[PDB]
Ligand binder design. Structure first.
Ligand SMILES: CC(=O)N[C@@H]1[C@@H](O)[C@H](O[C@@H]2O[C@H](CO)[C@@H](O[C@@H]3O[C@H](CO)[C@@H](O[C@@H]4O[C@H](CO)[C@@H](O)[C@H](O)[C@H]4NC(C)=O)[C@H](O)[C@H]3NC(C)=O)[C@H](O)[C@H]2NC(C)=O)[C@@H](CO)O[C@H]1O
Length: 129
């Protein structure tokens, strides 16, 4: 599924990401935009052989099982495929764990480089939330 901006904002808010660990909603929408272009089926391969999955590009090195990242963890206890669903529940619940794990949203490289410090509230302009 390719989400619309406000559509994704509403879903993320429904699922409790707004202000989660202190990160306002626009931070999450900005992160998603640059991680996946709001596309739930986004995938990308990392140099070490791990893969990143879904709207928030969650890394099989740590968070999910894809059976093809040996030595990795599965800290969200889910198949990485569940992170490609039209339904964002699994991605959001896993992102909650990731952002809690010490580095906050710096876990998302596109967020640190493209959203952090910027006017992220603009990403929710016009949305009915
Ligand atoms: C090639 C490329 O850059 N692709 C991107 C992916 O890398 C990226 O996924 C992110 O990947 C990084 C590095 O593997 C990952 O960061 C690591 O996360 C672990 C787990 O949270 C950290 O370990 C924790 O450290 C804290 C603080 O030190 C400890 O308190 C805590 O106990 C540790 N937890 C565990 C379980 O051991 C690592 O320190 C940390 N590594 C670095 C260098 O930051 C992110 O979690 C991955 N992010 C996501 C969303 O999965 C993906 C998104 O950034 O983007 C690709 O481009």
């Amino acid at each position: 599924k390719v989400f619309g901006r406000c559509e994704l904002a509403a879903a993320m808010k429904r699922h409790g990401l707004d202000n989660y660990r202190g990160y306002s909603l626009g931070n999450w929408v900005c992160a998603a935009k640059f991680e996946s272009n709001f596309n739930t089926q986004a995938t990308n391969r990392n140099t070490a052989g791990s893969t990143d999955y879904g709207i928030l590009q969650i890394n099989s090195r740590w968070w999910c099982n894809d059976g093809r990242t040996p030595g990795s963890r599965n800290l969200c206890n889910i198949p990485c495929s569940a992170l490609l669903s039209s339904d964002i529940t699994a991605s959001v619940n896993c992102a909650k764990k990731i952002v809690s794990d010490g580095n906050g949203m710096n876990a998302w490289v596109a967020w640190r480089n493209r959203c952090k410090g910027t006017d992220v509230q603009a990403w929710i302009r016009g949305c009915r939330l």
